Design an enzyme around this catalytic site. Sequence first.
Site, short mmCIF file in Angstrom:
data_model
loop_
_atom_site.label_atom_id
_atom_site.label_comp_id
_atom_site.label_asym_id
_atom_site.label_seq_id
_atom_site.Cartn_x
_atom_site.Cartn_y
_atom_site.Cartn_z
N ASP A 63 86.82 -18.13 36.90
CA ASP A 63 87.93 -17.19 36.77
C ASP A 63 87.98 -16.27 38.00
O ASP A 63 86.94 -15.93 38.55
CB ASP A 63 87.67 -16.33 35.52
CG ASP A 63 88.93 -15.98 34.76
OD1 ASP A 63 89.79 -16.86 34.61
OD2 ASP A 63 89.04 -14.82 34.31
N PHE A 76 84.49 -15.67 44.47
CA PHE A 76 83.39 -14.73 44.81
C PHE A 76 83.70 -13.66 45.86
O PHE A 76 82.98 -12.66 45.94
CB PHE A 76 82.10 -15.48 45.21
CG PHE A 76 81.48 -16.26 44.08
CD1 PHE A 76 81.48 -17.65 44.10
CD2 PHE A 76 80.88 -15.60 43.00
CE1 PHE A 76 80.90 -18.38 43.06
CE2 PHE A 76 80.30 -16.33 41.95
CZ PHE A 76 80.32 -17.72 41.99
N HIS A 186 74.11 -19.92 37.63
CA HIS A 186 75.11 -19.01 38.16
C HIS A 186 74.44 -17.77 38.75
O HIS A 186 73.46 -17.28 38.20
CB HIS A 186 76.08 -18.61 37.05
CG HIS A 186 77.33 -17.96 37.54
ND1 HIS A 186 77.40 -16.61 37.81
CD2 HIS A 186 78.55 -18.47 37.83
CE1 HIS A 186 78.62 -16.31 38.23
NE2 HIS A 186 79.33 -17.42 38.26
O1 LIG Z 1 75.59 -7.01 39.54
C1 LIG Z 1 74.69 -6.75 38.80
O2 LIG Z 1 73.86 -5.71 38.99
C2 LIG Z 1 74.42 -7.57 37.62
C3 LIG Z 1 73.38 -7.26 36.75
C4 LIG Z 1 73.15 -8.06 35.63
C5 LIG Z 1 73.96 -9.16 35.38
C6 LIG Z 1 75.00 -9.48 36.25
C7 LIG Z 1 75.89 -10.67 36.00
N1 LIG Z 1 75.63 -11.72 36.98
C8 LIG Z 1 76.67 -12.75 37.08
C9 LIG Z 1 77.82 -12.33 38.00
C10 LIG Z 1 78.89 -13.42 38.15
O3 LIG Z 1 79.90 -12.96 39.02
N2 LIG Z 1 81.30 -13.60 38.94
C11 LIG Z 1 81.92 -13.76 40.02
C12 LIG Z 1 82.98 -14.80 40.15
C13 LIG Z 1 84.06 -14.58 41.00
C14 LIG Z 1 85.03 -15.56 41.12
O4 LIG Z 1 86.02 -15.40 41.87
N3 LIG Z 1 84.92 -16.69 40.41
C15 LIG Z 1 83.87 -16.88 39.59
O5 LIG Z 1 83.80 -17.95 38.95
N4 LIG Z 1 82.90 -15.95 39.46
C16 LIG Z 1 75.23 -8.68 37.36
#
Ligand SMILES: O=C(O)c1cccc(CNCCCO/N=C/c2cc(=O)[nH]c(=O)[nH]2)c1
Length: 222
Positions: A63, A76, A186
């Site tokens: 997404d 990202f 991920h």
């Molecule tokens: O940032 C922190 O301190 C943190 C702490 C705990 C858990 C998380 C969660 N970790 C998955 C993050 C996934 O990020 N998604 C980004 C994304 C962007 C995009 O354009 N498309 C994607 O599929 N995915 C982040």
Amino acid sequence: EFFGESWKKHLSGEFGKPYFIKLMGFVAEERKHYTVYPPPHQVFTWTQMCDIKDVKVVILGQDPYHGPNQAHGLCFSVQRPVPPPPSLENIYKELSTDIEDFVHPGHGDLSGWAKQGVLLLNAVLTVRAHQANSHKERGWEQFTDAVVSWLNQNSNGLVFLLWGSYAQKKGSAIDRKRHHVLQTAHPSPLSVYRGFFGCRHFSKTNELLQKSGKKPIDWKEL
Ligand SMILES: O=C(O)c1cccc(CNCCCO/N=C/c2cc(=O)[nH]c(=O)[nH]2)c1
């Protein structure tokens, strides 16, 4: 105007299909009642950064970011001056140990990778503001499946980076002899320590690219 010509040449077979017209109508209607990200001119940024023939690496996302100023058409990535979200910080953290001379660029704009032929493709290309997955199963999945299928069938020695079960399913049908597939968790904080940290995907990508007869990505070129 917003869709790169080389990509349009090879993907336009999708445009007249019932699902695609329906999808276009859905997004247009959404934009009338809600704030939808990314902006119209940045839905297809991934087609604007390099010629389709020059794709070397494919990173599959899910997404788009759903916060203001975040999504700009590359998975990202966030344009200056937006702070890199947690997933991106983890990507940078892994890079800092995997690629010796890589240092945090101080921004989250991955355009420099895209220009080098790193395709940063979300599976779903629009989202309603503040509502994760709001445009899921409205047609985008079929379109981005078409993109992945085209690359699978028409490119050679690509490196696919599949992070998380969603990306891994999306990349399941890729020819593992013609192309190289790397899989791990991920980079989200909730899953990053389930394999992403220490995956060394970035150095590994460059090794595989050499074996494909191709020059490496400069991951520092951001
Ligand atoms: O940032 C922190 O301190 C943190 C702490 C705990 C858990 C998380 C969660 N970790 C998955 C993050 C996934 O990020 N998604 C980004 C994304 C962007 C995009 O354009 N498309 C994607 O599929 N995915 C982040």
